[PDB]
RNA sequence: GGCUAAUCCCCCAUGUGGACCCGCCCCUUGGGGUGUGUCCAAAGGGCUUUGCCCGCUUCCGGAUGGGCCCGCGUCCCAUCAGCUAGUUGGUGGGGUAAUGGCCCACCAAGGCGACGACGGGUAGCCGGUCUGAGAGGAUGGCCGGCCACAGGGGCACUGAGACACGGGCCCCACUCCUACGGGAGGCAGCAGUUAGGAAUCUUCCGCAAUGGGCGCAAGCCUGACGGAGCGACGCCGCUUGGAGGAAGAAGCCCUUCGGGGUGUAAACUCCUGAACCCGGGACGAAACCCCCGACGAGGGGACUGACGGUACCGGGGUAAUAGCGCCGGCCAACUCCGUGCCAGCAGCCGCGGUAAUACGGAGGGCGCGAGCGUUACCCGGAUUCACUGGGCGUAAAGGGCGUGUAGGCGGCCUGGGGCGUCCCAUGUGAAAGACCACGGCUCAACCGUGGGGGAGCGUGGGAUACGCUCAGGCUAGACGGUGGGAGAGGGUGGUGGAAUUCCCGGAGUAGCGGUGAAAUGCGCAGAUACCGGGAGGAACGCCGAUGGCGAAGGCAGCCACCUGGUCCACCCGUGACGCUGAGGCGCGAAAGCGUGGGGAGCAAACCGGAUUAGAUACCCGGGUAGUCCACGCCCUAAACGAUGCGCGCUAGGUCUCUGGGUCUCCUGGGGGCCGAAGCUAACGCGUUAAGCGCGCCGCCUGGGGAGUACGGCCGCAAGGC
RNA sequence: UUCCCGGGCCUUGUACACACCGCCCGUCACGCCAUGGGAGCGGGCUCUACCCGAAGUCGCCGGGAGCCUACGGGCAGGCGCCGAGGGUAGGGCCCGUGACUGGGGCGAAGUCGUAACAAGGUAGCUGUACCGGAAGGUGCGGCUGGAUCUUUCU
């Protein structure tokens, strides 16, 4: 049993990208899907699809990288530099609308889960709601 | 420590210990000389440093430096304790204030008068 | 003892109404209505006395101000862990404005506590204030709000209200008065005295203003207050001049004797005019009151000052205080002389023993300037208690190991509720302060008017992703079933051979033994070496590994029995049953303790021999506890991977133990070695993580003092925590 | 080429870096400072048990034993509970001084040891135990945080 499936998914993505994998399988759930959809729309991942591994649901996530680089270490820039759980089981952070944080001066995102659904920071402000602060990504 | 651990226990505020129980809280303290003598400083230096044993208005007994060139303090004189140490001496935690009570300000000192407690000289 | 009035006290009456018992109705805690019975009122004074004023009585409501009650928030020590007898509850009663163990009677046996009760220490709390990027830390003077106390302690009376600072009773301490019986006092009010202390003001003016008490008013009272005084204690404004003035006086300092510096600085020239004199001179003041009107509304009119002859305005008018710290780095400012580990400096590192930008003076310089330094204390920096925002292989820091209690945390799908969470509205968040705007004193400090913000909490409405919860469902976690394994895992009993020692016998002499060399020691009572036989105890060669098992400590001959853990295949069963784990409980090398055994070898202590300057030591000869078994304690360790447990994720290569497979190889589970990414102070770690993440526990916070002291718990003691 | 003296290069350990003519530990003595135990004694608090108990409120009596009366009762006064505070007895805790005593910390820098750091000259460390006045030594077991006869000191 994963103790925090969301943190687990984010971490899988992190590890995956850090070795420049083309894709990564996370065990599937609705909530994970919503978080993904947000990433995909934001451009951090190419996309994701549903797939059955050992006849079990998984979300396969297609990662995204930079162009090849020059000099020593040709390895390309990451599209996801930073992916981090904020609210965790055992400390759950919830923010009001006035408290939804601007991430990397706007270049990043924060993902919130709200009673309007899973939004980004901008989405939540424009919708005027707060909620649980899920993760930072930039 | 895990968050639950801080909820259970929590960080501990660090108490501060007074380097100077001249105390009764005070900035200065009146006292009476018991001994007036000299002492030999710590390892790297050599000199005869001038100090006094003082009984205090705080009912305390302490060694005090007698800063200056010359010093008039005698056995039974009354004196004002400043506080602050002399680093190369032993357990001298306080200085005597020049210019007040029986400790007169340093004879013929032109430059830093306030420390050493001497008034302004005369001009021709 | 006697006289006497009243708005003083009391009795009958009138009952608008009201209070009480009982009944009824509506509301629902003792709220409101109603009926019968009962019970309860009043005070008079002034006037221009025919009408009005000031009052009085009962009732209902208003307003203001309080009492009591609840949720939540409110410092340190667990070396304070158990506390409690009106204690916890009940029935009845007493008491109060009123609930209430607030108090008493009787009954029940309860109440509180690791979510920290009880105990000890400290402390008035807050709006705010200081600091801080913030979070936070620290504080609560002044001003506003609340509490509490009035020399210490108890108590009540009077009243709407007090258990009453300038009221009362009692006790205690203290000061005084005393005819020795006895009395009087209460500045933590203003001012003042004294003691203590580093330190904190005038025995001022005034009732003019605002406010308060009484009075119909006139008016009286007000050390509240409005002022003035003293202290650079703080903040703010202001001054000690302004312009001209040398290819650059003197003096003083440096000098490479050429010169360089103080420096336009001065002198001097001119100009302005702080102080100061003269003149004028306030605002704060309009009501109370007078007139008309009806003592109203309205309109009109006059008295009224501490500050003060102050501020201010006009005229006149003198170049007219500067100091304090620093100048080695941090840190802005350098030279000369004097001193020679002295005298001294010092916040830290450090400077001074003959060139001292560090001591002392001087010149010069930097910084502030009516101030400048110092000491003390708070925040800061310090991310150095780390929520923001730290750690633990070797720097401090993983608990010896486990089992599990409380607690913390929790896979996938669906539905209900909406407690957390979020949103809107709304009430509250006083004033002051902070912020913003505009304004008032010439400015500012200071002050006014206005606007905004604001966590938190109350009420109402809404949202449902996440967390919670309830109901249902799934199988990927977890456990089970079946069938295979490998194993020094544990307990019990038995048994085997090598060797040592000892005893018996044979044979057999002169030494053996031991060391660097020796000696003690053993041998003619026949040793050593050799052979045969016996007794006993302890440990298991080869196999044996760089191997295996266990949670750790730890486990090695062979056999049997009892028994724990674990791995793989099948994918068969249950359906989240999970992870962690403060306490608790159990295990826990060696040594050690107790009672009994056992005793071959080894062997602390010990007895000897050498070596050595000496020996207690290193080497040699003996040797007791002990080492071994039973049982009961002890609970430490480099108990080490110096690396807590679990889960998921992130290249490979290679050797190996053990399963499965179509067995080159692949697929599990172990042990190792190199190494991706990555990490790390480095060394190193690297699918057996010291990488990336999540959950929970333990632990750290400079070195010593010190795993010490005191306390407590445990222990037979040693000693442990 | 083993040895003695001097030297060169590579490697290893090091707590040395004035650099082994080094460093540190420790004992006895000498100077100060803080502290522990502590007989006995001085004062304080607190609890429990019992005795005394002011004021006052409340309760009872208030009687041919007092005062008033409209005969309904009122006051004085007595008694009781409670009760500040005092005493006695013991229990516990906190300061004060303290004979005697244990280490500890420094300090000019003396004394004699040579344990540790190089395989520190017997590898070290360690829990426990015995021995020594102590440094230490030895036993047993553990750790690697170990290097490839004796015989000093600077
Ligand atoms: Mg790929
Ligand atoms: Mg909120
Ligand atoms: Mg004292
Ligand atoms: Mg009379
Ligand atoms: Mg009379
Ligand atoms: Mg009469
Ligand atoms: Mg009356
Ligand atoms: Mg009547
Ligand atoms: Mg009626
Ligand atoms: Mg009211
Ligand atoms: Mg203690
Ligand atoms: Mg009682
Ligand atoms: Mg009353
Ligand atoms: Mg009752
Ligand atoms: Mg609780
Ligand atoms: Mg107090
Ligand atoms: Mg601020
Ligand atoms: Mg506070
Ligand atoms: Mg106040
Ligand atoms: Mg009192
Ligand atoms: Mg009194
Ligand atoms: Mg009192
Ligand atoms: Mg009172
Ligand atoms: Mg008074
Ligand atoms: Mg004095
Ligand atoms: Mg004053
Ligand atoms: Mg007045
Ligand atoms: Mg008035
Ligand atoms: Mg009136
Ligand atoms: Mg005043
Ligand atoms: Mg000029
Ligand atoms: Mg010149
Ligand atoms: Mg003129
Ligand atoms: Mg006026
Ligand atoms: Mg006026
Ligand atoms: Mg008229
Ligand atoms: Mg009028
Ligand atoms: Mg003028
Ligand atoms: Mg003029
Ligand atoms: Mg002049
Ligand atoms: Mg500088
Ligand atoms: Mg100086
Ligand atoms: Mg000289
Ligand atoms: Mg010189
Ligand atoms: Mg020099
Ligand atoms: Mg100088
Ligand atoms: Mg200096
Ligand atoms: Mg100088
Ligand atoms: Mg100067
Ligand atoms: Mg000023
Ligand atoms: Mg901090
Ligand atoms: Mg900070
Ligand atoms: Mg600290
Ligand atoms: Mg943190
Ligand atoms: Mg915070
Ligand atoms: Mg740290
Ligand atoms: Mg461990
Ligand atoms: Mg549980
Ligand atoms: Mg969940
Ligand atoms: Mg809700
Ligand atoms: Mg609001
Ligand atoms: Mg406000
Ligand atoms: Mg305002
Ligand atoms: Mg602030
Ligand atoms: Mg203005
Ligand atoms: Mg203001
Ligand atoms: Mg609501
Ligand atoms: Mg719904
Ligand atoms: Mg739901
Ligand atoms: Mg739960
Ligand atoms: Mg279910
Ligand atoms: Mg099986
Ligand atoms: Mg076995
Ligand atoms: Mg066995
Ligand atoms: Mg045999
Ligand atoms: Mg024989
Ligand atoms: Mg024979
Ligand atoms: Mg013989
Ligand atoms: Mg012989
Ligand atoms: Mg034989
Ligand atoms: Mg025998
Ligand atoms: Mg072997
Ligand atoms: Mg081992
Ligand atoms: Mg078995
Ligand atoms: Mg088995
Ligand atoms: Mg199945
Ligand atoms: Mg089923
Ligand atoms: Mg566990
Ligand atoms: Mg446990
Ligand atoms: Mg044991
Ligand atoms: Mg043993
Ligand atoms: Mg024994
Ligand atoms: Mg032997
Ligand atoms: Mg010998
Ligand atoms: Mg021996
Ligand atoms: Mg460590
Ligand atoms: Mg340890
Ligand atoms: Mg950890
Ligand atoms: Mg491998
Ligand atoms: Mg096979
Ligand atoms: Mg493996
Ligand atoms: Mg690398
Ligand atoms: Mg590196
Ligand atoms: Mg490696
Ligand atoms: Mg792995
Ligand atoms: Mg893996
Ligand atoms: Mg891991
Ligand atoms: Mg590390
Ligand atoms: Mg310390
Ligand atoms: Mg110990
Ligand atoms: Mg005992
Ligand atoms: Mg011990
Ligand atoms: Mg040589
Ligand atoms: Mg060469
Ligand atoms: Mg070289
Ligand atoms: Mg070498
Ligand atoms: Mg080494
Ligand atoms: Mg050194
Ligand atoms: Mg040296
Ligand atoms: Mg009594
Ligand atoms: Mg009476
Ligand atoms: Mg009594
Ligand atoms: Mg002593
Ligand atoms: Mg040695
Ligand atoms: Mg040794
Ligand atoms: Mg050695
Ligand atoms: Mg030992
Ligand atoms: Mg001994
Ligand atoms: Mg020995
Ligand atoms: Mg050993
Ligand atoms: Mg170490
Ligand atoms: Mg070692
Ligand atoms: Mg020798």
UniProtKB/TrEMBL annotation, chain B:
Residues 108-119 have a biased composition (Basic residues). It comes from the Bacteria. GO terms for molecular function: metal ion binding; rRNA binding; structural constituent of ribosome; tRNA binding. Mg(2+) 4 binds at residue 59. With S4 and S5 plays an important role in translational accuracy. Belongs to the universal ribosomal protein uS12 family. This is Small ribosomal subunit protein uS12. The lineage of its organism: Bacteria, Thermotogati, Deinococcota, Deinococci, Thermales.
């Amino acid at each position: 049993m994963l103790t925090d499936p969301i943190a687990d998914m984010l971490t899988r993505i992190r590890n995956a990208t850090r070795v420049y994998k083309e894709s990564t399988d996370v065990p599937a759930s609705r909530f994970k899907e919503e978080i993904l959809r947000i990433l995909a729309r934001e451009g951090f991942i190419k996309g994701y699809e549903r797939v059955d591994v050992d006849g079990k649901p998984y979300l396969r996530v297609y990662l995204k990288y930079g162009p090849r680089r020059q000099g020593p270490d040709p390895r390309p820039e990451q599209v996801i530099h930073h992916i981090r759980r904020i609210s965790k089981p055992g400390r759950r952070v919830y923010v009001g609308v006035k408290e939804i944080p601007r991430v990397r001066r706007g270049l990043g995102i924060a993902i919130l889960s709200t009673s309007k659904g899973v939004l980004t920071d901008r989405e939540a402000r424009k919708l005027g709601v707060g909620g649980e602060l899920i993760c930072e990504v930039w | 420590p895990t968050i639950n651990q801080l909820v259970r226990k929590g960080r501990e505020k660090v108490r501060k210990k007074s380097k100077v129980p001249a105390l009764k809280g005070a900035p200065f303290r009146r006292g009476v000389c018991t001994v007036v003598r000299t002492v030999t400083p710590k390892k790297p230096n050599s000199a005869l440093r001038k100090v006094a044993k003082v009984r205090l208005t705080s009912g305390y007994e302490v060694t005090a430096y007698i800063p200056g060139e010359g010093h008039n303090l005698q056995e039974h004189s009354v004196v004002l304790i400043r506080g602050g140490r002399v680093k190369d001496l032993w357990g001298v935690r306080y200085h005597i204030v020049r210019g007040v009570y029986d400790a007169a300000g340093v004879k013929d000192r032109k430059k830093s008068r306030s420390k050493y407690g001497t008034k302004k000289p005369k001009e021709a």
